Amino acid sequence: YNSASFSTFKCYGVSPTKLNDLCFTNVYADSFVIRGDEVRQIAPGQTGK
Amino acid sequence: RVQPTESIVRFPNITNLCPFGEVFNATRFASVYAWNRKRISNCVADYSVLYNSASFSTFKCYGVSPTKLNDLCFTNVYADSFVIRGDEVRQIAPGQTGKIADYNYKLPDDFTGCVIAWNSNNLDSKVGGNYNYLYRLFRKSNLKPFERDISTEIYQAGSTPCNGVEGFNCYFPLQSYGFQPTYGVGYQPYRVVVLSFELLHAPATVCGPKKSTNLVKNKCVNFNFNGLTGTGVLTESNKKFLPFQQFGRDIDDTTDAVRDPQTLEILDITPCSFGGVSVITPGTNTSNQVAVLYQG
Amino acid sequence: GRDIDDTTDAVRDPQTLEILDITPCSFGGVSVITPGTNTSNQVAVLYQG
Amino acid sequence: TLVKQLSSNFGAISSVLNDILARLDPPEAEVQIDRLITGRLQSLQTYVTQ
Amino acid sequence: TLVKQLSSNFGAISSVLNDILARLDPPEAEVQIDRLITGRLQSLQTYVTQ
Amino acid sequence: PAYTNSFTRGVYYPDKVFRSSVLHSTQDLFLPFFSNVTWFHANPVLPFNDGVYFASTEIIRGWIFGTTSLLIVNTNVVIKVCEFQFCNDPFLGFRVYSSANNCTFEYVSQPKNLREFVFKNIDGYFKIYSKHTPINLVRDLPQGFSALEPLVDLPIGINITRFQTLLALAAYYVGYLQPRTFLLKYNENGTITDAVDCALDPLSETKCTLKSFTVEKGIYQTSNF
Ligand SMILES: *[C@@H]1O[C@H](CO)[C@@H](O)[C@H](O)[C@H]1NC(C)=O
Ligand SMILES: *[C@@H]1O[C@H](CO)[C@@H](O)[C@H](O)[C@H]1NC(C)=O
Ligand SMILES: *[C@@H]1O[C@H](CO)[C@@H](O)[C@H](O)[C@H]1NC(C)=O
Ligand SMILES: *[C@@H]1O[C@H](CO)[C@@H](O)[C@H](O)[C@H]1NC(C)=O
Ligand SMILES: *[C@@H]1O[C@H](CO)[C@@H](O)[C@H](O)[C@H]1NC(C)=O
Ligand SMILES: *[C@@H]1O[C@H](CO)[C@@H](O)[C@H](O)[C@H]1NC(C)=O
Ligand SMILES: *[C@@H]1O[C@H](CO)[C@@H](O)[C@H](O)[C@H]1NC(C)=O
Ligand SMILES: *[C@@H]1O[C@H](CO)[C@@H](O)[C@H](O)[C@H]1NC(C)=O
Ligand SMILES: *[C@@H]1O[C@H](CO)[C@@H](O)[C@H](O)[C@H]1NC(C)=O
Ligand SMILES: *[C@@H]1O[C@H](CO)[C@@H](O)[C@H](O)[C@H]1NC(C)=O
């Protein structure tokens, strides 16, 4: 969060400030490149191309 | 044991009826983050007429039976009203958590009373969506039992001090609802009235409809003085009560005196005679006679 | 470490690898030594242990 | 002590049977009267042993 | 024996009080706390009788 | 503003029940014994932490409470409780407020001595106790017992933290109540006759433990350390 102003730093279901305390298992990482207008499409319960 | 003979009940002669319709179906309620408190006192209530008929989605009474709400007296019944999200109508209960549970309205862990809700998808389902109804999302800490907050300040998240810039890591603390008339049941607005009341605070006057009965004395009877139920022998005594005192106690915290609400006279209470029974027998080989001896 | 009755008696520092003893804080019972109310009102106080 | 051990809640809502019976339906009062019974039985047992 | 008795569930999920207080919500953790308290009072009444 | 001390003053009837020939232990807000009580002359903003023991030996009529709004004056009494606009010097001539915009509860009652009062805010009430007793010693709060009796119980429920006196254009003491436990002693008539502060001295705690006012020779266990 103390970085180069992540534009869409917004977690779902869990508060980002409480991420550190809780312990998860086997995190996956997905990386790709899209356009600015298409960033709003990446969200649970949302549709679009 | 000495069995009772008749029963007497004494409630104060109060004529005016508690205003309930002025609270339940009013013109417009308030938001969930700012809820008003209507205090009801000094009247004769009737919760059964609000129990039957009409159409209420939920009627859940905690710590008291809704059926028996018309014979016990109370002390300054409170009333709260607000409009709630459809899926959170069950989130207002003692103990259980939630967003609005700890950020809008937190009931105590020992709450007593009744939670009343009913459908409000007719007048509050505006075609464009009522934007007047507003809820809070961000707060530094959780709320306390029966706490309200109105103040709106820019929230702060970690570093990058906000001090009113509503920028990065800074959010407006509270967000609206929006009520389109075609949403599902999870989004549809609901209307909630929370009734809460304290039992042992003072000898108050709000009571259910119960006709009084003439006083009897020097007989083991059942009495009912303003929700105080017990069996005893009511006499006339000379103990001096100060004008503000109502009840009376003894060395081991047992009610041995009382003041009747109507006549305002001092009466004592003495338990009806008890005792064990012992039988003297000369043995069932010589004779079949006995001799009973009440002990006390 | 435990000694005879499943009570922790010594622990190891997880960063410097040192053994540290553990001893309970001091408790007891306050008592009042009085010569009688009908003789005086001066008392003395005894802390038990 | 035996008499004073009659104004304790023991975990119920009120230490009065005539109050509990006048505020709760039978389905939901026997989870309260039971706590009262347990507490008062233990009090009597201690008294008798002493 | 009185000291060693402090390491038994008595029906709760754990003997350590802090784990129960830091693993469960209060209104539900009250029953586990009450189970432990009942067990330990019944463990002190013995060692006084005997 | 001099400083004096109270001598077992400021005990009231905590409950509405009647007791006779009983030694009771109540846990409520009480003024601690031998406490340091201020002694003003004749009116700044006096803080209202939890309660106030206002005693005057008489010109002193009013008590405007609030945060920056209850009001009591002496017509006989008006208790208008609503938003006011207070002046720099709120005295009775008379300008104390500007208007009553969103006004609320308004109780007008029917239109050598020591006056003692106790004000409290618990769960939405404003309790006032009082007791008028004769005295011949000028100022210098005497030694004895005067159990205060309940006077009114206002169902107001507001946020009071600062109060100020309405001087009538005169000495009054102000002591603050604290959470303390007492051992009240009732006589056969139902009146409070004596009290013991169970947190003042070791002997007081010993008296409080045994539930008696006299202690014989010996050693007793009071509490834990
Ligand atoms: C990698 O990216 C993160 C995110 O902006 C930044 O904080 C970090 O300094 C970067 N590391 C390097 C070596 O540039
Ligand atoms: C609704 O208001 C009317 C007033 O005309 C009255 O029946 C009562 O106060 C309310 N009834 C219900 C069921 O809300
Ligand atoms: C109503 O009760 C009062 C006592 O508060 C009593 O004085 C009065 O006589 C009662 N009314 C009637 C009609 O008896
Ligand atoms: C009853 O008494 C008679 C004599 O008094 C004796 O012979 C007989 O055995 C007794 N029977 C019993 C059952 O006690
Ligand atoms: C942990 O890190 C500190 C920091 O330098 C170091 O002094 C210490 O030796 C380390 N402990 C272990 C067990 O490596
Ligand atoms: C205290 O002792 C004196 C003489 O020793 C006696 O006269 C008095 O009665 C005693 N006080 C009480 C309360 O017994
Ligand atoms: C009250 O406080 C003042 C100084 O603040 C002190 O001189 C005075 O002795 C105190 N009162 C008592 C009874 O000790
Ligand atoms: C009451 O007033 C004080 C200022 O005197 C303020 O700080 C506080 O937030 C207000 N509300 C409560 C509940 O104390
Ligand atoms: C008080 O009334 C005025 C108009 O007379 C109104 O503007 C103001 O909002 C009201 N204040 C409250 C707290 O209702
Ligand atoms: C109780 O009050 C009566 C009423 O006058 C009085 O005669 C009696 O002395 C009082 N009892 C006391 C002071 O112990």
UniProtKB/Swiss-Prot annotation, chain C:
Placed within the complete protein, the shown segment runs 566 to 614 of 1273
Query: What is the role of this chain?
Result: Attaches the virion to the cell membrane by interacting with host receptor, initiating the infection. The major receptor is host ACE2. When S2/S2' has been cleaved, binding to the receptor triggers direct fusion at the cell membrane. When S2/S2' has not been cleaved, binding to the receptor results in internalization of the virus by endocytosis using host TFRC and GRM2 and leading to fusion of the virion membrane with the host endosomal membrane. Alternatively, may use NRP1/NRP2 and integrin as entry receptors.
Official protein name in the record: Spike protein S1
Assembly and interactions? Binds to host ACE2. RBD also interacts with the N-linked glycan on 'Asn-90' of ACE2. Cleavage of S generates a polybasic C-terminal sequence on S1 that binds to host Neuropilin-1 (NRP1) and Neuropilin-2 (NRP2) receptors. Interacts with host integrin alpha-5/beta-1 (ITGA5:ITGB1) and with ACE2 in complex with integrin alpha-5/beta-1 (ITGA5:ITGB1). May interact via cytoplasmic c-terminus with M protein. May interact (via N-terminus) with host bilirubin and biliverdin, thereby preventing antibody binding to the SARS-CoV-2 spike NTD via an allosteric mechanism.
Going by the UniProt annotation, this protein carries glycans at N38
